[PDB]
Amino acid sequence: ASGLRPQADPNAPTEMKAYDLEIQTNLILKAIEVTAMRMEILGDNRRPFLSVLATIVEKSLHIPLCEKILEMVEGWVFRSEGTWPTLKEKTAVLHKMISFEHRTDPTMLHKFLNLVLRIYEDPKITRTELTVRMEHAFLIGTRAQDVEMRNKFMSIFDKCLSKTASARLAYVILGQNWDTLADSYWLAQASQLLLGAVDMNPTIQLHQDDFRTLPISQLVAPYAKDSREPSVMIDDKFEAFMANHRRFLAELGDVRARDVLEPLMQLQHIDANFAHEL
Amino acid sequence: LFDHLKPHPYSHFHAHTTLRILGKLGGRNRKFMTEALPVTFQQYVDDRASFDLRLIGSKRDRAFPAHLGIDLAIQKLTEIRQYDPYYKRQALNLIIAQTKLRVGFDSVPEDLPRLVRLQVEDLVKKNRDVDISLFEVSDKERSIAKKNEEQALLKRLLKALLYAESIPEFKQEVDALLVNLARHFTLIEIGRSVIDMKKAYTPFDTKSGEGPLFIDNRVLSEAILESLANENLEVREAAKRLIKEMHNAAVTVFGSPMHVPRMTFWSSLASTFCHGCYEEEWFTKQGGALGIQTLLTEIDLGDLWVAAKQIEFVRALMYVVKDMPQDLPEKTRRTA
Amino acid sequence: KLPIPKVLHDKAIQMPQPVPNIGGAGSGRPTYTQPALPKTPAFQLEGEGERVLNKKKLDELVRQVCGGTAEGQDGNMLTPEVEESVLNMADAFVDNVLHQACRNAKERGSKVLEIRDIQLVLERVYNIRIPGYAKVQPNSNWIKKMSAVQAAKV
Amino acid sequence: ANWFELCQMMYVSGETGEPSLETTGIIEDIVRQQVIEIGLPWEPASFYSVEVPERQRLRKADERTKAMTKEEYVTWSEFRQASFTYRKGKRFREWAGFGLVTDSKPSDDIIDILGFLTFEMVQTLTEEALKIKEQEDLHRERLTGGGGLFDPPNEGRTPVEPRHIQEAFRRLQQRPKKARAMLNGTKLQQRTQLKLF
Secondary structure, three states, X not given: OOOOOOOOOOOOOOOOOHHHHHHHHHHHHHHHHHHHOOOOOOHHHHHXXXXXXXXXXXXXXXXXXXXXXXXXXXXXXXXXXXXOOOOOOHHHHHHHHHHHHHOOOHHHHHHHHHHHHHHHOOOOOOOOHHHHOOHHHHHHHHOOOOHHHHHHHHHHHHHHOOOOHHHHHHHHHXXXXXXXXXXXXXXXXXXXXXXXXXXXXXEOOEOOOOOOOOOHHHHHHHHOOOOOOOOOOOOHHHHHHHHHHHHHHHHHOOOEOHHHHHHHHHHOOOOHHHHHHO | OHHHOOOOOOOHHHHHHHXXXXXXXXXXXXXXXXXXXXXXXOOOOOOOOEEEEEEOOOOOEEEEEOXXXXXXXXXXXXXXXXXXXXXXXXXXXXXXXXXXXXXOOOOOOOOHHHHHHHHHHHHHXXXXXXXXXXXXXXXXXXXXXXXXXXXXXXXXXXXHHHHHHHOOOOHHXXXXXXXXXXXXXHHHHHHHHHHHHXXXXXXXOOOOOOOOOOOOOOHHHHHHHHHHOOOOHHHHHHHHHHHHHHHHHHHHHHOOOOOHHHOOHHHHHHHHHHHHXXXXXXXXXXXXXXXXXXXXXXXXXXXXXXXXXXXHHHHHHHHHHHHOOOOOOOHHHHHO | OOOOOOOOOOOOOOOOOOEOOOOOOOOOOOOOOOOOOEOOOOOOOOOOOHHHHHHHHXXXXXXXXXXXXXXXXXXXXXXXXXXXXXXXXXHHHHHHHHHHHHHHHHHOOOOOOOHHHXXXXXXXXXXXXXXXXXXXXXXXHHHXXXXXXXXXXX | OOHHHHHHHHHHHOOOOOOXXXXXXXXXXXXXXXXXXXXXXXXXXXXXXXXXXXXXXXXXXXXXXXXXXXXXXXXXXXXXXXXXXXOOHHHHHHHHOHHHHOOOOOOHHHHHHHXXXXXXXXXXXXXXXXXXXHHHHHHHHOOOOOOOOOOXXXXXOOOOOHHHHHHHHHHHOOOOHXXXXXXXXXXXXXXXXXXXX
């Protein structure tokens, strides 16, 4: 795919027929399944098994095999009860699984991020050793292109922190590590966190020294004390016209802070210059 | 040329070619300057427009700029992954909110219809017993340049709203909003006509100044002019429908179509469409010709009005014929 | 013209790294004067400071070897006259070890000073072994002489 | 090499934390140096020409064993089997340089003895370094409210450091005064060989 020339090396990578590839993959799946049910007595073989699993997930592009490995890892993390595969060693495989972000196929990445979201919404595992080692995965989730996933991650993030402006600024400045997102403009996430400490319910309006269009009340003020009667009678059509106009006027003055603030925090994620301005 | 000089991850072919060209130029590559250097500046020094916000751990309100994401929103809306509709929806939301903020909120009396009909009665006749003292107070504390900037921004917002009709998902909401705005502006225009009629009948030289400063609601005319000669069809149809809606609202408010052409609005519309015919862009010329055609064959203001405007119309159309380059398509000249 | 290659060699595409200040002119001079990415000078925002740690180092060592100090007393474990002796000892040790090691390193044809020379000097002259930093047999003439002596003895 | 074996041995001895790579490296170099440096013939029955046929560690260990859970007990039992040479003969021989310093292919009893000795060295080093670290912390002992989403629950436990291992090694190299009693009253420097602790 990269077009690199083939060199003369006895162990040089080669290509295999599709039929042989499928046969090999089926054999590998059977071998892994049979080996993984005796995890309590592997002993000296405990580490090579996890090493080969990590290599497979890191390099292979076979969707069924990666899906099976991920399902096994999730089963270890959640439904396991006995002595674990070397306690917090499955975290090594989970960390190796972060490579899905640059694959041009978001299926495996989406499965992994769903698993991470599950891990970080479970009350049993809160402030535990597991949630301290998945910071990189959580940040990668907050950086996701998929809008729904990113919004879910940011919603959890905002739900955890406090709701005071000084506290949120302090957390941004010295409360978080941004080493994981060092190659991207990560101040958009910081701005999104900051905007969570703003009241979004109250109505808004421009100041009194700003410029707007001509109000009708100013135009009808001269007739304040004119107690006259129009020569032409008021008809139903005029009444409906004025009722609709009054409804529109009422709808005019119903702008809240969210109607402006939310679109900006959504739009800052596709343009860096506006993020800088914000 | 200086924009191709970027390090490795950037294409090195372009950068090395540019470096070679500059090296071959030699001493001439730093001697071409004739003027000093361009610099960007603001037209006014007053504070910009803003609204008030509220931080949770505080007791006071703070001002927030009201111009922040308008440029990006318009660019993302009127210039066209599976996530595009999401961002387009966000942009439309922001634009609608900004337009609503710029129009403003008002509280009118209970018996508005009576006052409106009294205004119509005074306009049809030439009553001279109307007090316009509030419209002679001088406003010598604010900036006129800032007002011009706000007017231009509102015109841009209206143009974006009008363009947003070429998307089947957004059509209904923007259409309803535009119709409501047109009716509101007709109501404004009737009162403005009354005030203008009263003003010209008191030729004085007293030391009373002009009126207050406000955003002119006639930006819609310019937006309509710029929308008539659009590539998409729905945009043109909506632009025509807005003119028809304004005329219908005026007819409904007056009671009969007899005295509708006594407003000052229609002369302004005619002047806008006539000046459109003299610009140096062919689509502005086409819009002007189409606007004159719409005023002629779809509203029917009367016969005295046309007899008054015929000379200007003929001059403008003949100029459009005169000034079109002879190697572009012939559609504009045929329209004229 | 100039031969723009279809691909650049690995040296031209490097992702620059921090670099030290070389040249010998000096740094920080406010006069009329550069690498792509210089290295950040060292700094400390707030703390005890070196002037206190260096002075407390000797008391720390004394506490370490003395076995332990009871509550309510510390620091004054050596009289003023013994501290001067200890500091002189340290200076003399450093100077002597370095002087021996440099000459030993130059003896074997090297042009740089490596840890092996210091380790050799420390082990063979002072009986000190610092972990964590990485035979003789008689020849034939001696054997013949011993054989002759043994034959004479019998 | 032998990093994880060292980790298991430290865990068994009482270091439940996660020591860095420097500590493991230093311990490995110490053990390698010792291994490289490395009835009965002298019994009373040897006095004659013709022979004739005949005829605090425990307390702490017990306290810990009483103070462990079932999973902790299983982990402790599994880690107790860590070895340097158990079914690793070729790797151990390569790591210890058998060929370069001795005739190749020694018997297996030698390998078992070497494994036993190495386990003992690691145990002793860990036990001494723990005490040194504890004393240092005890002497040394004598602002972010709110909270985030990744900070540890309680923390408070840290592993040993290279300086502690160095101090333990310095302590373990001292010899009895009997090996120096013959230099009393003189100005002669004591020079010896590496002590096999």
